[PDB]
Design a protein around this nucleic acid. Sequence first.
RNA 1: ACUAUGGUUUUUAUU
RNA 2: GCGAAGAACCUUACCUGGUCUUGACAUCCACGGAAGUUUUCAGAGAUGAGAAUGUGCCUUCGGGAACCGUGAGACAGGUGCUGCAUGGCUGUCGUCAGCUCGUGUUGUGAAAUGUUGGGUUAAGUCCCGCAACGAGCGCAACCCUUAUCCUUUGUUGCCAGCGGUCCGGCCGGGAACUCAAAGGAGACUGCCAGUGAUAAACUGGAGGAAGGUGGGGAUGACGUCAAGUCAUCAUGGCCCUUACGACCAGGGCUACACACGUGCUACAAUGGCGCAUACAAAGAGAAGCGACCUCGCGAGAGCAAGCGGACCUCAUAAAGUGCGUCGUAGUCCGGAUUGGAGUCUGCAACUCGACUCCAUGAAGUCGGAAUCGCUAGUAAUCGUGGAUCAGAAUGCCACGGUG
Lengths: 98, 206, 150, 100, 79
Amino acid sequence: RIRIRLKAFDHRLIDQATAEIVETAKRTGAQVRGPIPLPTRKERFTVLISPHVNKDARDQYEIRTHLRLVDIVEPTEKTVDALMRLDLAAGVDVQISL
Amino acid sequence: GQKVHPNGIRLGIVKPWNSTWFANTKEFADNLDSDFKVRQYLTKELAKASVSRIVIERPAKSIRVTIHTARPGIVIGKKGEDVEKLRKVVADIAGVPAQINIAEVRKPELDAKLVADSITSQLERRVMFRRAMKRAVQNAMRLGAKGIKVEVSGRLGGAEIARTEWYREGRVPLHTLRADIDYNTSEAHTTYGVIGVKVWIFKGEI
Amino acid sequence: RRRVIGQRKILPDPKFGSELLAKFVNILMVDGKKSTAESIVYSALETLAQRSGKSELEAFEVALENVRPTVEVKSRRVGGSTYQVPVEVRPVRRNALAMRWIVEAARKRGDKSMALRLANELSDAAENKGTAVKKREDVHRMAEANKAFA
Amino acid sequence: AKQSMKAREVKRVALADKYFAKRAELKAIISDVNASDEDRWNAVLKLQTLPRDSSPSRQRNRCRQTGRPHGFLRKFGLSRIKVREAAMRGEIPGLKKASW
Amino acid sequence: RSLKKGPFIDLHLLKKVEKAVESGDKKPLRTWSRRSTIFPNMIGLTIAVHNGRQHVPVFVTDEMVGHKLGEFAPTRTYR
RNA sequence: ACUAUGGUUUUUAUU
RNA sequence: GCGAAGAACCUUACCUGGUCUUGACAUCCACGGAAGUUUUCAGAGAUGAGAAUGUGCCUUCGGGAACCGUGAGACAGGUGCUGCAUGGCUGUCGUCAGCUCGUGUUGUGAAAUGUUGGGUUAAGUCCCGCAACGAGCGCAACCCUUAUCCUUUGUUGCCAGCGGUCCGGCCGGGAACUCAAAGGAGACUGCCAGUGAUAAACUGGAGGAAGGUGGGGAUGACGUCAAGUCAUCAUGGCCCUUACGACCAGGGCUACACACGUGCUACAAUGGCGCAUACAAAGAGAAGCGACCUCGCGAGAGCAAGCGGACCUCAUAAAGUGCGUCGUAGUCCGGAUUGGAGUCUGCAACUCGACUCCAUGAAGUCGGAAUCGCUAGUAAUCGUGGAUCAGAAUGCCACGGUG
C-alpha cells in the first residue's frame, strides 16, 4: 500500500485537498474507504486585550488542525504524483510514504 | 470603554487570508518571524507604490509573495527588471528562495488603503484637507461604495493644532452579524507631523 | 427590589413518615456533608426517648411549643422612629427559628458529642434555663414595654 | 532592548564549538563526588566557567520581537501586544476569536 | 563547607599570596573578593578584605574549620 | 409631611 | 499580589573604582589575519603581553564569506525628558440611558423642541398622546451556551437492528442510545381571561423540558479628572555628548527603631488520623513526558522501558461510602524559632537558596471604629494542571464532587 497525510487549519481547504485524491478516484471507479474526517485537534490561547497598562482584561483565541489520511488501494499518477504538485490551493501540508 | 475590534470574528465564514501557510507548532514562531520580516522589507521598498494589500504563501522550502497594486509599472520598472532586484534583495532574509508575483487592482478610490493614499498624497500636495476628505467620500460612493467614513487627527492642515475631524454617509457597521467591511489605518508623515488617517468602507453584496 | 421568587417546600420522607422528621438532613447538617447528617436521622429521636420516652405524639409537644417564635420586632422609619413595632408571626414559622437562630456557644466551645446532640437540644428546649433563654424571652417583655406605636 | 544588545544577542552564542563542544565529556563528571582523591584535574577544572556573559548560564530564548527575556508567548516567540496587533489584522493563519 | 563536599583552593590566589608574604608582615595583602573561602595556607598570613570603601584585617588560626572572607568585615549599619 | 442640631479646604500657569 | 511570571551576575535603572570619545549598534570606502589548537605572566576584570601552532570554505588567481582586528568622513548614540504638548490606550459613572443630526417649530440670540408629557419598565424601553416627523451610535433582538426532543456522522472508542461466529465489537457491517463532532425545533402576549386609557404593561389559566431580557455569554454611544502613560508604541521640541553614550569589576536595589493595604495559615472534637473503596473534568509531552530497578532514613545518584498523541508515560481525583481509634487537655492542636545531620546546582549560596530526616516550641479561643461579597448548585467544604523554569507566587488561566 501507498499512504498519504493531508493536514490544514481550514475546514473547506482540507476537503479541497481530499477532492483531488477521492473524487478523482471515485470518477475512475477506484476502490475507496469512504468519508472519514477523523477526530479534530484544537488548542486555545488567552491574550491581553489592551496594548497598555490594563493587565486584567483579556480575550480568547482558537487554532484548529484537521488531519485526513483518505486511504489508497488503487494509487495513480493522477493522485499520488499530483497531490505533491498542487499549486491552486494555499495553506495545506501534504506528506506521503511508500 | 475599550471599543476594541468587533469585526475580527467575521473571517469564520471561510475566507482566503493575507498570510496563508502551514507549520509544525515547534517551527510556527520562526515562520511568524520571517512572515513579519519580509512584509516589513517589501512595504519599505513599496512604501509609495499604490499597494492595496500584500499576500504571503509558503510552498515547500520556498516563499511566494503577491503584490496587489493599482500601478503595476512602478513595481516592475524598465524591461521588467526592477522586480528582479526586489526579489534578489530578500532572497535570503527568510532562509528560503523568494518568489515575487504582481496582481492588478481596479477601482483604486474604493479601497480603504488607497483612499488613505489619496489623502496622504493631497496632504503631500499641501491642499485644503477638508476638501480632499469630502472628495474621497463622494468619489468612493460614485465608484461603488454604499457607506463610508474618513477620519483625521492632529496637526490638521499643517497647523499648530491637535484635534480630530471626520465625514460619513451610508453607515459603516463593524459589530453587526453581516457587513463584509473594508478597513484601514495609516500615517501621512507630513513636515508638520505624522497625521493619523482612519478609513472604513461598506460596499454590500454580502 | 422586584424579586418575587417561588417559596421552597419539603415533602414528608416515607422512611420517617412526617414533614417534621424530613428536615434533619438540613438542621444540624454542615460543610455540605448531607449523608453524614443522614447517618443519625430518627435514631437521634430514639436517643431522645432514652432521656424522656413519651412516644412521637408527645416528642415535640413542649420541645417546640416552649421555643417557637410568636413575634417579629425592629423599627419602621416614619418620623421620630426611635421605638419598636411588634407583629405576631404567621403559621409558616410555627416549627421554624428555634433550631437555627442561635450558635453562640456551639461555634465557641462546641456542643458535646454529635450523635447525642439532637437528643440534647430537644431536651434543652424542654429545660429552658441559661443558654438560648434571653434571645427568646426578651421579646416577651419588649413587646409590652415598647408597644405605643402599632 | 537596544541594537547594541541585539549584537550581544549573537556574541552570546558564538562560543558553541570554542568552549561548549570539546570538553562536554568532562562536563558530565566535573562535579560528581563518586571519585578518588580531592583534586585530580585542576588544569581543566575552570575552562568551562572561564568564559563569562557568553555562557549557557546566561542563554535565554528571548522575545524575537523586543529582545526581552521574560513575559512572552514561546509558541509565537513574541509578547501579548504583538499577538493582539496581528489579530486585529486577522494576520496569523488559523488563529480565530473563540472561548469555547 | 567549602566546595563539592570537600577542600577547595583557587591556585591563582594561592600564588598571589606566595608573592605577598615577602611584602607583609605589617603591610597586609589587600583583596577585593568576599566570595572566597578560607584555606589552611592562611595560617600566620597578613591579609585585608574589602568592605566597599576600605579594607579590614583578617587573621586565620588552626581552630577555623570553614568561613567566607565577607564574614570578617560586616557592611550594614543596622540602627 | 415623617426625628431639633453639626463648621473649615491659601492667592496661584488656567483652558 | 504595582509598571515587572522568579535575584550571585542577568532583564537593571542606582553607586564607587577601572576603560573609550565620530567612539559603536550599523552602511559605503580602507585593510591584515582563517575560525582555531597548546599555554604562561600581570589586572578586580575589561584588557595587555609571552611562547608554540592550523592554513579550512572561497579561489576569473583578480577577489570574496565565516570568525576576529584596525583606520577616515558623512555622523550619530541614549538602559533620557516633556501627556501642565500630542495621535492614542486604560482607568471613572456604567450596561448608566443617554449623546447628537436632517427639515418643521419656539427664542432677539446664546440656546431649546424633537429627547418632554401620561401609562410601564432593566431600557430615550414598549405604548398612548402631542409642534413635530424621521434618523446614526448606546439600549434590544439576530448572535454564542443550555434545559426537552429531533436530525446527520466516526477512529485504534460505541454496538442496539441485520449477519457470521476463538461465542468475544472478535469480525462483516450499522449508529439504537451513550462520547465527540455539531446542527436544528421551540417563545410570538402568540392563545384564553382579568386589571387598564377593553394601548402598552403586569398576573393567573393552557400547551411546554422551559414564558413574559428563562438564566448565563457577547460586549461598552457622548463626555469630564489639565487622572496615569513618551516602560506598549508613535512623535515634535528639549536635554546629555571625555558623557546622562558605550565597555567592565565589585557593591546596591532584598538596607530597618512603626504605619497600612494585598493576601495566607491556625484560632480544633459533625475536629485529627489509621486501614479499606468510587466517580469528575482538564492540561503538559523526542537537550522532552516519565514508568521499572538498585543504593540510601530521604532529598538524590546511577541504570532506564514505553510515547509520538482520543492510540502511550505524568495518574488508583479528595470529601462523601465502610471499619476502627484519640481522652477532655491552649489539646496527639497551632505554627514564629533556637539546634543536630544531609541532597544539589551555580564563577559563589557569608551577605542572598530550594528540598530531606530527627531533637525544641511562643502568639493564637472569631477580633474596635469601619469597609465588605451574597437572592441558591450560590453561603459551607473537599479535590486537578499549566505558563515562568538551578532556586523562586498565596496572583493568573483552566476544571469537578457534596450542598
